[PDB]
Curated annotation (Swiss-Prot):
Note: Knockdown of NEO1 in C2C12 cells results in the enhancement of the BMP-2-induced processes of osteoblastic differentiation and phosphorylation of Smad1, Smad5, and Smad8. Conversely, overexpression suppresses these processes.
Localization, UniProt: Cell membrane
Species of provenance: Homo sapiens (Human)
Domain Fibronectin type-III: 20-114
Similarity comment text for this entry: Belongs to the immunoglobulin superfamily. DCC family.
Tissue spec. comment: Widely expressed and also in cancer cell lines.
Glycosylation sites: N49, N68
Protein name: Neogenin
Taxonomy of the source species: Eukaryota, Metazoa, Chordata, Craniata, Vertebrata
Gene: NEO1
Primary role: Multi-functional cell surface receptor regulating cell adhesion in many diverse developmental processes, including neural tube and mammary gland formation, myogenesis and angiogenesis. Receptor for members of the BMP, netrin, and repulsive guidance molecule (RGM) families. Netrin-Neogenin interactions result in a chemoattractive axon guidance response and cell-cell adhesion, the interaction between NEO1/Neogenin and RGMa and RGMb induces a chemorepulsive response.
Residue numbers of the full-length protein present here: 429 to 535 of 1461
Comment block on domains: The Fibronectin repeats 5 and 6 mediate interaction with RGM family molecules.
Length: 120
């Protein structure tokens, strides 16, 4: 999106920003992924004109990856390509014509210990 660059995170003129979503919870916890589910943010009761970004990162790790909801307004999203029996901090955030507002609270989600190699 015509991204830019800076030297010292120089300040830039921008309008107001929304507020992270609420009721941030995991509808389901898979061994290779985790189902997330949240409600509309106070700033946007419809959050239909703003996308939602989910940042996941192992407890302690700073390197986190963002996952844009396949579709805007989706009050739910799935995070595949995860490790079983491993804690992960999921953070949901809203995004509108402006950009990234506030990052929801860090949700501690722990996957389940896969069955293992034995197919059985």
């Amino acid at each position: 999106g015509s991204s830019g660059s800076s030297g010292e995170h120089a300040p830039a003129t921008t309008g107001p920003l929304p507020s992270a979503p609420r009721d941030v919870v995991a509808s389901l916890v898979s061994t290779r992924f985790i189902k997330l589910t949240w409600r509309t943010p106070a700033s946007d009761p419809h959050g239909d004109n703003l996308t939602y970004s989910v940042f996941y990162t192992k407890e302690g790790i700073a390197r986190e990856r963002v996952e844009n909801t396949s579709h805007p307004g989706e009050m739910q999203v799935t995070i595949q390509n995860l490790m079983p029996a491993t804690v992960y901090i999921f953070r949901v955030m809203a995004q509108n014509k402006h950009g990234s507002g506030e990052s929801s609270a860090p949700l501690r989600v722990e996957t389940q210990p896969e069955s293992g190699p034995s197919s059985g």
